[PDB]
Amino acid sequence: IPVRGAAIFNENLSKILLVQGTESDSWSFPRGKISKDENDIDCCIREVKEEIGFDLTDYIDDNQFIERNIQGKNYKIFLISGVSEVFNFKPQVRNQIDKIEWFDFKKISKTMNIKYYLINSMMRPLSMWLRHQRQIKN
Numbered sequence: 001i002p003v004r005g006a007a008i009f010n011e012n013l014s015k016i017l018l019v020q021g022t023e024s025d026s027w028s029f030p031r032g033k034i035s036k037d038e039n040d041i042d043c044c045i046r047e048v049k050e051e052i053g054f055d056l057t058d059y060i061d062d063n064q065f066i067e068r069n070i071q072g073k074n075y076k077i078f079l080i081s082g083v084s085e086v087f088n089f090k091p092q093v094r095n096q097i098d099k100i101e102w103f104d105f106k107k108i109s110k111t112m113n114i115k116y117y118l119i120n121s122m123m124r125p126l127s128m129w130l131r132h133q134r135q136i137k138n
Helices: 040-052 122-138
Strands: 002-010 016-020 032-034 065-068 073-080 099-104
Touching: 002 016, 002 040, 002 099, 016 122, 032 040, 040 065, 073 122
Parallel strands: 002 073
Antiparallel strands: 002 032, 016 099, 065 073
């Protein structure tokens, strides 16, 4: 039942990488259900690797995340930066997701043309985290 995933930002903290699943047209964080034989990090790493072909092992920080209980499910979304915009993202299995695209992060706030899921309700802490990262890395 618990879900783990990642908010994956590019190097200059201006874009976020979102995916659209096979079951709907909304864009959200790459993520998946936790298996009984794994912890929060291993779930995130495994699911993101399957969805976008990128290994977060050396990017993930187990103390940087947003956890929200939404609609009967527990979400824990790890906060990631420094991921290359030119990496050739591709799912390990073709049906793990439908699409993978970068989004301009500041522009997402426009919504509520494009449907989002989870990210809009996390917009406040996500934005605060990002702006703080932007101070650190100057």
